[PDB]
Amino acid sequence: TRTLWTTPDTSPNCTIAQDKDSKLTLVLTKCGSQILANVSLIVVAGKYHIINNKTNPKIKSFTIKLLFNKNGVLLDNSNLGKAYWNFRSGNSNVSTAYEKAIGFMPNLVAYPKPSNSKKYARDIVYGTIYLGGKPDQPAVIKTTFNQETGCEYSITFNFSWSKTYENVEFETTSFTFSYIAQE
Amino acid sequence: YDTRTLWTTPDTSPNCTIAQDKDSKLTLVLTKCGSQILANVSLIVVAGKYHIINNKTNPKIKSFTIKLLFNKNGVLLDNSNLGKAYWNFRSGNSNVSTAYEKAIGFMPNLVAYPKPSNSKKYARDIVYGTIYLGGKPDQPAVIKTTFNQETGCEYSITFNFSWSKTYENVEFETTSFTFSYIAQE
Amino acid sequence: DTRTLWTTPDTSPNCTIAQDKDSKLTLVLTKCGSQILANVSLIVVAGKYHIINNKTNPKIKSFTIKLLFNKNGVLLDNSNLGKAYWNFRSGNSNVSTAYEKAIGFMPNLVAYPKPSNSKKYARDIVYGTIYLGGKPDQPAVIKTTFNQETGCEYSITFNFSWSKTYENVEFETTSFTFSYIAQE
Numbered sequence: 001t002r003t004l005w006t007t008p009d010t011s012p013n014c015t016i017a018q019d020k021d022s023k024l025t026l027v028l029t030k031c032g033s034q035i036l037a038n039v040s041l042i043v044v045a046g047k048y049h050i051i052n053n054k055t056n057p058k059i060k061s062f063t064i065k066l067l068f069n070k071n072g073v074l075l076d077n078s079n080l081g082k083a084y085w086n087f088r089s090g091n092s093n094v095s096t097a098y099e100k101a102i103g104f105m106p107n108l109v110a111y112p113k114p115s116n117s118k119k120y121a122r123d124i125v126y127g128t129i130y131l132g133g134k135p136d137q138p139a140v141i142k143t144t145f146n147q148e149t150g151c152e153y154s155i156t157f158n159f160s161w162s163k164t165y166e167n168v169e170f171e172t173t174s175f176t177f178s179y180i181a182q183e
Numbered sequence: 184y185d186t187r188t189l190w191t192t193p194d195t196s197p198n199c200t201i202a203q204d205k206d207s208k209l210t211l212v213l214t215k216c217g218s219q220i221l222a223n224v225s226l227i228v229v230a231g232k233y234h235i236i237n238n239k240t241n242p243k244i245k246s247f248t249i250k251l252l253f254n255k256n257g258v259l260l261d262n263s264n265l266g267k268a269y270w271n272f273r274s275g276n277s278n279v280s281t282a283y284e285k286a287i288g289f290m291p292n293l294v295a296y297p298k299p300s301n302s303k304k305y306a307r308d309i310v311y312g313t314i315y316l317g318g319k320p321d322q323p324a325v326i327k328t329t330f331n332q333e334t335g336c337e338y339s340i341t342f343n344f345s346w347s348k349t350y351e352n353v354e355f356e357t358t359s360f361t362f363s364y365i366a367q368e
Numbered sequence: 369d370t371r372t373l374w375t376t377p378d379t380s381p382n383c384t385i386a387q388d389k390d391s392k393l394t395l396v397l398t399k400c401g402s403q404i405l406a407n408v409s410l411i412v413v414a415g416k417y418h419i420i421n422n423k424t425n426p427k428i429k430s431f432t433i434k435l436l437f438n439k440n441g442v443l444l445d446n447s448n449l450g451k452a453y454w455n456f457r458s459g460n461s462n463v464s465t466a467y468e469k470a471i472g473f474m475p476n477l478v479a480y481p482k483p484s485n486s487k488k489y490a491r492d493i494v495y496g497t498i499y500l501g502g503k504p505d506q507p508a509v510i511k512t513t514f515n516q517e518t519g520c521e522y523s524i525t526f527n528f529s530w531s532k533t534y535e536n537v538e539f540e541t542t543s544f545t546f547s548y549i550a551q552e
């Protein structure tokens with residue numbers, strides 16, 4: 001119960017543009033007041049599988065959203081499928097869907113929901129990953145905490161790029177970050 | 184009472200003095216994972232010289248430093264830029280009621296990161312990161328973190344913020360950055 | 369379980385890049401359950417990579433440091449890092465017994481498979497940038513790859529490279545933090 005994850009296999013678990021077009025590998029490990037997070041993405045099919053910005057000059061970003069309720073349970077409007085998200089058991093998941101994971105949620109005082117008051121940038125973490133592990137193929141992973149509606153907590157990953165890629169498969173190196181835990 | 188986390192609390196109440204009294208909120212969380220401290224930092228400037236950057240008007244305003252100085256018990260010294268009043272071990276979203284007296288296990292390791300001396304100075308006591316002003320991807324600024332290089336203390340953690348772009352009316356409030364360092368014990 | 373496996377934090381050379389004991393690799397691995405929190409820096413003290421001059425030697429642009437492990441997570445003798453002071457922490461030194469088992473500190477084989485003819489995914493790589501002499505205008509890239517070496521059950525390799533034309537620049541670095549998924 002110290003780690004929530006997607007099993008680190010390559011079986012698609014995520015829907016960006018079409019059903020099960022991607023494998024998000026996300027590992028959240030609770031180190032007390034902070035969650036240590038490790039993320040990568042493999043797009044296996046559909047619109048975002050092979051990037052060609054000569055053909056499609058405006059296809060330059062997409063977003064994967066994890067939406068959680070008050071008990072830290074994943075909501076079905078999330079891009080990541082519910083069947084694929086649970087506490088670790090060996091290299092797999094527990095057979096039983098978890099009921100509570102509030103200790104893994106992003107802190108609401110650190111990262112408040114949208115309101116009429118001033119919005120601060122500290123609810124964002126920026127990182128760069130590399131497509132196909134090539135050092136000349138950067139893309140930005142923007143991670144934002146608790147900025148989605150229709151939920152109590154959220155983690156969203158926005159992937160974007162500024163270079164003009166021609167026939168580049170969207171599968172990434174890994175990135176580590178952390179965030180302040182709710183409890 | 185959370186003895187594994189020293190922090191500023193996660194509120195936005197100013198706790199730090201860069202150019203003038205309580206002109207900023209340094210949000211800093213140090214979580215002890217044994218021999219390493221996992222650190223998470225961001226900064227919100229609310230007033231004074233570093234609140235609104237305009238390098239067309241002020242071409243020389245390009246950097247500033249926030250210093251955390253610690254005595255032999257890991258207690259924050261009052262000449263630090265960070266205030267002592269809300270730097271403490273965690274209790275919920277606030278702090279423990281009494282000011283802590285020992286935090287040596289959170290201090291940067293003196294063999295990894297020695298104080299200045301006649302011995303060769305090595306770069307491993309620095310960590311560089313980039314954060315983004317206002318969360319905008321075209322507004323980078325560098326955060327340079329240095330361990331145990333200040334005099335007049337047993338330990339130190341200093342944050343130097345700097346930028347190279349000519350920003351015009353850009354508020355200095357940052358995205359968050361995570362790093363770690365080797366603990367003293 | 370909560371332990372630290374490390375090189376010790378001293379500056380005594382422990383690593384062989386081009387010639388024997390030409391460098392100090394400072395590496396600290398801390399187990400936080402299913403992830404290992406890693407902290408790394410490098411000091412080259414002698415040999416080919418100590419002082420970089422790309423005006424006189426423009427092709428000297430990269431080098432690799434490898435840690436090879438057996439089925440029990442024990443460091444192999446043919447790694448660039450020496451076995452003598454790679455062990456579990458005790459104060460600012462090591463435990464007096466060389467460790468027998470560290471499978472919990474090894475990179476997860478499903479996340480990061482050994483080389484095979486299956487597709488090689490990029491998720492077994494982490495890129496970072498460190499700075500030579502602590503100077504902000506002297507970046508070098510540290511590319512870390514998991515379980516891509518043969519003749520071992522697990523591996524961590526550090527490739528250091530740079531694109532700037534450095535002139536008489538000493539190769540000693542700032543520190544970088546990353547994590548990886550643990551085997552157990």
Ligand SMILES: CC(=O)N[C@H]1[C@H](O[C@@H]2[C@H](O[C@]3(C(=O)O)C[C@H](O)[C@@H](NC(C)=O)[C@H]([C@H](O)[C@H](O)CO)O3)[C@@H](O)[C@H](O[C@H]3[C@H](O)[C@@H](O)[C@H](O)O[C@@H]3CO)O[C@@H]2CO)O[C@H](CO)[C@H](O)[C@@H]1O[C@@H]1O[C@H](CO)[C@H](O)[C@H](O[C@]2(C(=O)O)C[C@H](O)[C@@H](NC(C)=O)[C@H]([C@H](O)[C@H](O)CO)O2)[C@H]1O
Pocket residue numbers: 126127128140162163311312313315320321322323325347348499504505506507
């Ligand atoms: C990478 C690059 O080209 N940077 C140059 C920048 O170019 C702009 C875009 O780069 C950014 C940006 O907007 O600033 C870089 C951000 O980090 C990115 N944000 C994130 C979250 O990753 C950001 C985003 O990717 C984009 O904005 C998208 O949102 O990009 C660059 O992408 C863009 O490139 C394309 C464009 O995409 C295309 O559309 C177009 O067709 O072609 C352009 C090419 O122009 O261009 C943007 C500019 O219009 O521009 C700035 C000035 O505006 C600089 O030139 C910058 O390069 C740097 O300049 C400084 C001096 O001014 C130094 O030379 C920097 O080199 C280093 C060095 O010395 O080696 C790098 C070191 O890592 C750094 N050290 C540390 C510790 O951080 C040092 C140090 O800062 C200085 O030495 C001071 O001590 O600087 C050099 O990178």
Ligand SMILES: [Zn+2]
Pocket residue numbers: 044049
């Ligand atoms: Zn394909």
Ligand SMILES: [Zn+2]
Pocket residue numbers: 228229230234354
């Ligand atoms: Zn303001």
Ligand SMILES: [Zn+2]
Pocket residue numbers: 412413414418538
């Ligand atoms: Zn030297």
